[PDB]
Structure 1
Amino acid sequence: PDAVFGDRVRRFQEFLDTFTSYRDSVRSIQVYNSNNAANYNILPHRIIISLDDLREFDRSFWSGILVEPAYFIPPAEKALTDLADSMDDVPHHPWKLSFKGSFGAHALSPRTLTAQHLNKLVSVEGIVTKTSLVRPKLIRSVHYAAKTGRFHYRDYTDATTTLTTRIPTPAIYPTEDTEGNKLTTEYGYSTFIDHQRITVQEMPEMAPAGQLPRSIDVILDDDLVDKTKPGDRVNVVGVFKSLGAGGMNQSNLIGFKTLILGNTVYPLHA
């Protein structure tokens, strides 16, 4: 990595004192992970950040997030975890963000999208309409050989990662190290997360004259699984990613499906 990450992590270390109330709530998560171990021998790792001190610290970083979020969230991702280690050193894992938001000018209802609002933080609302099912998903695989001792490792991430894009690894089955070995896939020690795609359309009360509704489909991951029933009035915040190939890879009409990689799915009652 560059200095482009380098100064960028350092400025998110000045975000622990001006609004140090966020540094209080990290310990409260570390409280319930100890006192549950005191009864046996629940809380997620998601920190609600108001998008309100960022106007009062740096206007060139607050307007940075709402324009190109694939370059400022993964820096602020790793900056939070090292502060989530140095304060809490007793026990021996993403630590995601939320963005409460103080909702900006990207407050667009799902009828007005897709044109210049790619790669931004939209705040879409509406009525949920499909509610698909839950399946697990592989992230890390730890192999183990018992003829030479040591464990092993394999990262594996899909195109629906946290925010960015990298070289896609179609890792079916990592086996057969540089020896004569029959490697073993340790379950339990590996990691798995949940995955659920729901589709949301616009509200029929704020609709225009008689037409068909236009829906948009949002991916939820790592925390918000089984949060809303179908047929609820839901406000969602995410990043308007757009993945897939538009028929240019298969050497041969329509193309480029769009998704939202949601964070805060926040039920409303109005």
Structure 2
Amino acid sequence: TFFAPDAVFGDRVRRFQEFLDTFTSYRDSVRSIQVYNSNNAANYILPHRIIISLDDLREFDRSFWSGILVEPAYFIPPAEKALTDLADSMDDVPHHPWKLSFKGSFGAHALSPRTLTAQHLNKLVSVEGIVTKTSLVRPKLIRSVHYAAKTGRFHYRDYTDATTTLTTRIPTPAIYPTEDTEGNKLTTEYGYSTFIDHQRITVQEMPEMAPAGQLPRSIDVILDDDLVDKTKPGDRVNVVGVFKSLTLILGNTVYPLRQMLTDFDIRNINKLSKKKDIFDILSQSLAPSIYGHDHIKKAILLMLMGGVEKNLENGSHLRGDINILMVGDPSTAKSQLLRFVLNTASLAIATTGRGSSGVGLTAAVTTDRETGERRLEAGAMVLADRGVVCIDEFDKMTDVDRVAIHEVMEQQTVTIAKAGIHTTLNARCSVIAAANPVFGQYDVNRDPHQNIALPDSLLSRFDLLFVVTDDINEIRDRSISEHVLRVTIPFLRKYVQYAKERVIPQLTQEAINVIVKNYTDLRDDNTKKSPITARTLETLIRLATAHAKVRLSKTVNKVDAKVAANLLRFALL
């Protein structure tokens, strides 16, 4: 500014001017920005930034590309000076800075935040993950305008941050002025004083790419005025910034947004797609350490593969997730099945159901003295957005989390309004609840409603309620000892993810009538043993679709509704 520019600034500003003269894709874009602003001013805004495609910068200039990648403090500046000069030259009407943004592949600069260390400080870092906290929007002080009243005129003195500079200039403070020259009181005016707002968000690594079992490492992003309305907790994000250490990143570009598949594994899953004996052996091959319970793991197989997640036009979305509650005597392997479903799914989060430090799983409030304010902590269900969560000891879970899962069940989301924030989050996850009775034991002669120790709304929320009995019987109990005294794990994961990514099933007339007949025949159970609701209609075709996608057919069949009715007869009677 005040210093004389050398050839080290002039050469870089003429190289960026030559790159902008070669590629008119940013010049017509900033002309579109200006004509949109002129049309809105004529009717009476966009936050003045142009995303630059990095693929045109590698083949045009290798040294400029290398200088951007190793010294952005000496390379970003002159490029934004060229952009402001191009914005002044492209406009010819009378009468603010302009910023930049990048996109594309980075190579070794794109990395996990747990691997982000003290190396490559000055170089720009692209890092993806999940956000945990989003602070309160706070306006700062820049250019306050003061009015001296006895002589009647305006004064103005501006301030400077020590981060928003991406480079170097002399730094020093200045007292917020309270007395003009010689000495007569003067008043403040905030009508014209700018209040650039800033934000401070936290982002850690994603649970699917990280080596799960370890601790997540989070970093802080300081945010400007422009991009303050595009951040919310619970979403997968990819930030692009500069790792400055006065350690934080000066995030300029934010983009809101796993086994490898070969061509030999696709031949094996295409070979196993037309045999009609696949489902039973795939349900039997998940846990060989647990004797019996075939239909329960058949429903667990249909549960971990998923649904369809149908989004209606101009209306609310439809629930694709399925939910399973399992009750019975505490003698069997209900606590041993959660470790298997946690270690064999795509991504899964297991909680004990009692012991959450916050208000539950979904979130918690915290105070920070850094900002001197209150931030949000995301404990669980907001991390897994497409996977599964497992809660054992469901009866020990309090009413606050029960009210929370009453709302996020069919809703498939959540909402929070708190001191200084109001928002709604989306989280379509699937729950696996395991409970125990309050009497300790249960037999067939006791009634099946009071033994559950849960309200009727929670029985209506959960789709499949599986009762496991363990009365002592000498005939069946003879082979458990030799069975526990005596297809694979990396194949079903690839099977489930290929079915989840490629094939979406649709309905046919052959499977609508049989499920209509089954729903109308059960709507019998109301007079004999269990209430049937409208939500159950939806869950009776979800499972069918499931089976139809287990066989990966493009549409459903009648046998999918038949195996769903067989699962219903086992879990209801």
Task: Identify the TM-score tier after normalising by the shorter chain.
Answer: 0.7 to 0.9
Q: Shift of the alpha carbon at 1:188?
A: 2.6
8 Å CA contact 2:129, 2:237 repeated in 1: yes
> CA 1:147–1:104 in structure 2 vs 1: closer, same or farther (change >3 Å)?
farther
1:65-84 mapped onto 2 (5 Å cutoff) = 65-84=68-87
Asked if structure 1 preserves the Cα contact closer than 8 Å seen for 2:200 and 2:221, the reply is yes
Displacement after TM superposition at 1:79 (Å): 1.7
Contact kept, 8 Å, 1:142 with 1:190, in 2: the verdict is yes
Contact 1:159/1:165, CA 8 A, preserved across alignment: no
1:216-270 deviation per Cα after TM superposition (whole angstroms, max 9, x unaligned): 1111112111312211100110001111xxxxxxxxxxxxxx1000011110xxx
Q: TM-score, normalised by structure 2?
A: 0.42
**Structure 1 residues 172-211: Cα deviation after superposition (integer angstroms, max 9, x where no partner):** 4134343444344332322221111111111111222522
Report the alpha carbon displacement of residue 64 of structure 1 after superposing the two structures with TM.
Answer: 0.2
What SS is found at the alignment partner of 1:83?
helix
Task: Give the aligned length.
Answer: 252
Q: Residue 218 of structure 1 corresponds to which residue in structure 2?
A: 221
- RCO higher in structure (CA 8 A, sep ≥6): 1
176 and 89 in structure 1: CA distance in 2 versus 1, 3 angstrom threshold: farther
Separation of aligned partners in 1, 2:36 and 2:145: 28
Pick the structure with more helix per residue: 2
CA 86–135 in structure 1, closer or farther in 2 if over 3 Å, else same: same
When residues 7 and 141 of structure 1 are mapped into structure 2, their CA distance, relative to the original with a 3 A threshold, is farther
Deviations, residues 4-31 of structure 1 (Å, cap 9, x unaligned): 2232222221122211121001111111
SS at match of 1:125: strand
Alpha-carbon spacing, 1:36–1:54, altered in 2? closer, same or farther (3 Å): same
Identity %: 100
Moved more, 189-198 or 63-72: 189-198
Distance 1:53 1:205 in 2: 33
How has the CA–CA distance of structure 1 residues 146 and 75 changed in structure 2, closer, same or farther, with 3 Å as cutoff?
Answer: farther
Determine if contact 2:164/2:250 at 8 Å carries over to the other structure: no
CA distance in 2, matches of 1:80, 1:149: 39
TM-score by length of 1: 0.85
169-178 or 49-58, larger mean C-alpha shift = 169-178
Write the distance in 2 (CA, Å) between the matches of 1:147 and 1:8.
49
Aligned-residue Cα RMSD (Å) equals 2.0
Shift in Å, 1:119: 1.1
Whole-angstrom CA distance in 1 between matches of 2:104 and 2:46: 22
The DSSP-based 3-state class of the residue aligned with 1:4 is helix
Query: 1:91: how far off?
Result: 4.1
- Which moves more between the two structures, 207-216 or 15-24? 207-216
Range that drifts further, 230-239 or 88-97: 88-97
Cα separation, 1, equivalents of 2:28 and 2:212: 50
1:162 offset after TM fit, Å? 2.8
State whether structure 2 residue 156 is matched by structure 1 residue 148.
no
Alignment deviations for residues 94-129 of structure 1 (CA, whole Å, 9 cap, x no partner) = 210011243332011111112212111111000100
Supply the distance in 2 between the matched residues of 1:13 and 1:179 (Cα, whole angstroms): 48
Task: Give me the whole-angstrom Cα distance separating, in 2, the residues matched to 1:26 and 1:180.
Answer: 47
Unaligned runs of 5+ in 2: 257-573
Change beyond 3 A, Cα 1:59–1:233: same
Q: Distance in 2 between matches of 1:91 and 1:147?
A: 34
Structure 1 gaps of 5+ residues are: 244-257
Q: Is the 8 A contact 2:140 2:195 kept in 1?
A: yes
- 1:50-96: CA deviations, max 9, x gaps? 11222222211111011011111112122211211121121442210
Do 1:50 and 1:102's aligned partners in 2 also have CA atoms closer than 8 Å? no
Cα displacement (A) at 1:36: 1.3
Question: 1:2/1:100 Cα in 2 relative to 1: closer, same or farther (>3 Å)?
Answer: same
